[PDB]
């Protein structure tokens, strides 16, 4: 299923400045063990999250799980992929920029990858090797599940 | 945009449907922080200003009179100078 | 289809380079066993000069999962357990086998690969470490004793190789060379000694006959085996073995593996057990009619896609006349049970003392299988009006069978009952009615059979001799 990155991240703040938009809150979290920060935005009403949670994040290239391209269509009745239904927050999306910190002479070692999920936004940032999978203009699913 | 919890589409997505063909435009919403551009969070915009329209899909940002209205560099003007006349008329009618 | 998809992918790559792919691989590295196995495959297809032929020897190592250490260009050693050999544990390097040297000097790396496979299989022994070294020592003692027993027979009678194979203590024995383990040739069938009138000489082929291999193999149970040569003192006629304990209770037994499983009858299992005592089949498996198993062994010697679908009515074409033989499995023996037997691949013997007796029983069972086996054939004899003389084989008793045929000159059924008393000896009696024409002399048929081969053949001689008179 092209899992592109995975970790159990930890919610270290829910809204650094203010509740700017009412039903969307920007969890700012630090992953444990790879030290990669996240700044996801989540629909609080349908996925209530609370401070201190540990969630499994699996930005995956495909939901189907058998490979194959999305076609980008809400094929509603399709169950044939038998995709990653285990997780409980699948937001779809796109990646808008893959900024980094490269001097002209050498490549960066702290790539930051801004990923846009339908207006709500995310910035996984961290060691270059881990985010190496991502590429610009690709649809990348975000899947999350809250783990005790 | 949100799938598993329930299928809920985002307004930006269904406004990226009225937008015609492919256009690249970046502008500021009427309420814009006078300092955000310089500091951190520049491209994740805490308040959703910085409309960016890349490829014909609003990727981020709220739309104001300057972004959608009668000013140089307005989303409407990008279309006339690239995409055309009839397509621009259809896009205006659909938005309304 | 898959190739067409790959070509389309190459077209997509062209539209998108090899340099970019290398950069992507480098990025992944900055961010295994199957790739190692793949290396051996593409290095096996690699064939160039001596330097690359040494890399082909390195490919052979990882192909068999071996470890290669090379001192200088000339010497490279593949090392695992005690299986260490060098092309220039607990033992000296035994020999510069011409077999291995000839294959390497000539362009046959494939033959060298087979030889390593044989060595690895011989030492697939489980055991542990010090136990493995002792277990190999026991095999060495058995080999020395078996070799001495063969030498005693040659000293007592200067028999030709054929006599040793057909009727000798042990059998023609070739000492283990490299991977190949000792082979004792139990029997050489008369039909197959002749190829398309072979004279054996001392150049007897490894596979030109029926061959059995002697080896040590791990067992769940624990047994006591000689760890030193047991023929310290040999009586001049036959052999005398000094009694055990030296010995140790290693969890394994010596084996006599047969390359192709031999169908053996229930009666043989009892006759063989009477001597050794070790259960021949231990966990009682399956046991169906013997004649079916004999047909499968004969038919499967040469494999063809279409199953014969004989229905136990094999058809045989011969220079004069045409014959059809019904094998008649399921005929009740005196006990009331049809001859029933199961394929045996491995026979386990602690010491070689019971081995002369076990082999003599096996030779008799193999001989009976060969005579009845000669008939089994892939014949599509359909709508045959001329001839088609029809014979039926019935199992009268274990070790006996009757071929029944219409009298060649008169009309009553006449039956020849053949008993395989010993591997090379069969005694046959013709049963003929009180008023009948003397069909044959039992000696003339014997002379023709010994000079030629098989039993579909014996029936021809009986018919021809009767007609000539």
Swiss-Prot record, chain C:
Post-translational modification: Phosphorylated by MAPK1 or MAPK3 during G2/M phase which may enhance protein stability and promote entry into the nucleolus. Phosphorylation increases its interaction with PSIP1.
Region forming the signal peptide: none
Stretch list, region Interaction with ESR1: 4-469
Sequence segments annotated as region (Interaction with the Mediator complex): 84-174, 177-341
Compartments, as annotated in UniProt: Nucleus
Tissues expressed in: Ubiquitously expressed.
Region (Interaction with the Mediator complex and THRA): 1-469
Self-association and partners: Component of the Mediator complex, which is composed of MED1, MED4, MED6, MED7, MED8, MED9, MED10, MED11, MED12, MED13, MED13L, MED14, MED15, MED16, MED17, MED18, MED19, MED20, MED21, MED22, MED23, MED24, MED25, MED26, MED27, MED29, MED30, MED31, CCNC, CDK8 and CDC2L6/CDK11. The MED12, MED13, CCNC and CDK8 subunits form a distinct module termed the CDK8 module. Mediator containing the CDK8 module is less active than Mediator lacking this module in supporting transcriptional activation.
Function comment: Component of the Mediator complex, a coactivator involved in the regulated transcription of nearly all RNA polymerase II-dependent genes. Mediator functions as a bridge to convey information from gene-specific regulatory proteins to the basal RNA polymerase II transcription machinery. Mediator is recruited to promoters by direct interactions with regulatory proteins and serves as a scaffold for the assembly of a functional preinitiation complex with RNA polymerase II and the general transcription factors.
Similarity annotation: Belongs to the Mediator complex subunit 1 family.
Record's protein name: Mediator of RNA polymerase II transcription subunit 1
Gene that encodes the chain: MED1
Residues of the full protein shown: 13 to 518 of 1581
């Amino acid at each position: 299923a092209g899992i592109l990155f995975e970790d159990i991240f930890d919610v270290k703040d829910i809204d650094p400045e203010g509740k700017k938009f009412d039903r969307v809150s920007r969890l700012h979290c630090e992953s444990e063990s790879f030290k990669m920060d996240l700044i996801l935005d989540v629909n609080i009403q349908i996925y209530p999250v609370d401070l201190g949670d540990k969630f499994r994040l699996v930005i995956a290239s495909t939901l189907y799980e058998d490979g194959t391209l999305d076609d980008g269509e809400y094929n509603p009745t399709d169950d044939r992929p038998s995709r990653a239904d285990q997780f409980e927050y699948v937001m779809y999306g796109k990646v808008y920029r893959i900024e980094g910190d490269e001097t002209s002479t050498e490549a960066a070692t702290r790539l930051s990858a801004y990923v846009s999920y339908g207006g709500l936004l995310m910035r996984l940032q961290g060691d270059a090797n881990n985010l190496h999978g991502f590429e610009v203009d690709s649809r990348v699913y975000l899947l999350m599940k809250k783990l005790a | 945009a949100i799938l598993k919890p329930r299928p809920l589409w985002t307004g930006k997505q269904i406004f990226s449907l009225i937008i015609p063909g492919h256009i690249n435009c970046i502008r500021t919403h009427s309420t814009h922080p006078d300092d955000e551009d310089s500091g951190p969070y520049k491209h994740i915009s805490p308040g959703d200003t910085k409309v960016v329209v890349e490829n014909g899909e609003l990727i981020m940002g709220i739309l104001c009179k300057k972004s959608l209205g009668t000013s140089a560099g307005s989303l409407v003007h990008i279309s006339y100078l690239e995409m055309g006349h009839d397509i621009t008329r259809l896009f205006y009618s659909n938005i309304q | 289809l898959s190739k067409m998809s790959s070509l389309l992918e190459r077209l997509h790559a062209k539209f998108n380079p090899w340099s970019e792919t290398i950069k992507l691989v480098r990025q992944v590295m900055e961010k295994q066993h199957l790739v190692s196995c793949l290396e051996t495959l593409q290095k096996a297809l690699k064939v160039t000069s001596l330097p690359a032929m040494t890399d082909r020897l390195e490919s052979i190592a990882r192909q068999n999962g071996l470890g290669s250490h090379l001192s200088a260009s000339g010497t490279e050693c593949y090392i695992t357990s005690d299986m260490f050999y060098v092309e220039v544990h607990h033992g000296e390097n035994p020999v510069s086998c011409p077999e291995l040297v000839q294959q390497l000097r000539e362009k046959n790396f494939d033959e060298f690969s087979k030889h390593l496979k044989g060595l690895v299989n011989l030492y697939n022994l489980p055991g542990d470490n010090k136990l493995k070294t002792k277990m190999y020592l026991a095999l060495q003692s058995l080999e020395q004793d078996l070799s001495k027993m063969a030498i005693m027979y040659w000293k007592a009678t200067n028999a030709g190789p054929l006599d040793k194979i057909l009727h000798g203590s042990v059998g023609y024995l070739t000492p283990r060379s490299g991977g190949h383990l000792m082979n004792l040739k139990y029997y050489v069938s008369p039909s197959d000694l002749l190829d398309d009138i072979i004279l054996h000489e001392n150049n007897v082929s490894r596979s030109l006959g029926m061959n059995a291999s002697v080896t040590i193999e791990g067992t769940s149970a624990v047994y006591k085996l000689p760890i030193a040569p047991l023929i310290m003192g040999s009586h001049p006629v036959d052999n005398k073995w000094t009694p055990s304990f030296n010995s140790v209770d290693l969890p394994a037994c010596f084996f006599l593996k047969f390359p192709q499983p031999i169908p053996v009858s229930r009666a043989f299992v009892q006759k063989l057990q009477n001597c050794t005592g070790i259960p021949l089949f231990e966990t009682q498996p399956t046991y169906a009619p013997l004649y079916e198993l004999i047909t499968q062994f004969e038919l499967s010697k040469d494999p063809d896609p279409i199953p014969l679908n004989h229905n136990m009515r094999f058809y045989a074409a011969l220079p004069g006349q045409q014959h059809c033989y019904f094998l008649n499995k399921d005929a009740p023996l005196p006990d009331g049970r049809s001859l029933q037997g199961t394929l045996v691949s491995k026979i386990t013997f602690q010491h070689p003392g019971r081995v002369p007796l076990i082999l003599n029983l096996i030779r008799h069972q193999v001989a009976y299988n060969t005579l009845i086996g000669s008939c089994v054939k892939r014949t599509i004899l359909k709508e045959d009006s001329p001839g088609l003389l029809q014979f039926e084989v019935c199992p009268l008793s274990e070790s006996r069978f009757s071929v029944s045929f219409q009298h060649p000159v008169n009309d009553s059924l006449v039956c020849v009952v053949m008993d395989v008393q010993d591997s090379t000896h069969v005694s046959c009696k013709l049963y003929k009615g009180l008023s009948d024409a003397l069909i044959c002399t039992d000696d003339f048929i014997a002379k023709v059979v010994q000079r030629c081969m098989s039993i579909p053949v014996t029936m021809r001689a009986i018919r021809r001799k009767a007609e000539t008179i």
